[PDB]
Amino acid sequence: MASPHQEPKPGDLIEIFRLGYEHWALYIGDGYVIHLAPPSEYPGAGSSSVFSVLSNSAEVKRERLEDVVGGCCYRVNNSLDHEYQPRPVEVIISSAKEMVGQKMKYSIVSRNCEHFVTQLRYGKS
């Protein structure tokens, strides 16, 4: 018979279901993922501004899948295979690793973690 649950492999797009929202990550093997940490409204927080409250930012990071998902549910969902060519998975993971340590802007980025993990396969070249 077939397996009762999914298991992630190198290059897989991880789809994570939080309370009332969804989030995404790039799985790299050995239980690890690469992901974008979400930003906030901090420099424009209510009743304050850049002189009275500090800034914030998003950052590409590497962690364990378990640590990243926490109490949230998750699945493997490689939807972009229908959109783009079969790119060489070592270069998608190398792109993820090259992106780790890079920053992105404030709250105004909106839904952006799927757009980030999209660019790892779409912008391979």
From Swiss-Prot:
Organism: Homo sapiens
pH dependence: Optimum pH is 8.
Region (Essential for its ability regulate keratinocyte differentiation): 1-40
Record's protein name: Phospholipase A and acyltransferase 4
Domain of life: Eukaryota
Source organism phylogeny: Eukaryota, Metazoa, Chordata, Craniata, Vertebrata
Topology with respect to the bilayer: Single-pass membrane protein
Gene Ontology molecular-function annotations: acyltransferase activity; N-acyltransferase activity; phospholipase A1 activity; phospholipase A2 activity
GO terms classed as biological process: lipid catabolic process; N-acylphosphatidylethanolamine metabolic process; negative regulation of cell population proliferation; phosphatidylethanolamine acyl-chain remodeling; phospholipid metabolic process; positive regulation of keratinocyte differentiation; positive regulation of protein-glutamine gamma-glutamyltransferase activity
Keywords, comma-separated and alphabetical: Hydrolase, Lipid degradation, Lipid metabolism, Membrane, Transferase, Transmembrane, Transmembrane helix
Membrane topology (Cytoplasmic): 1-125
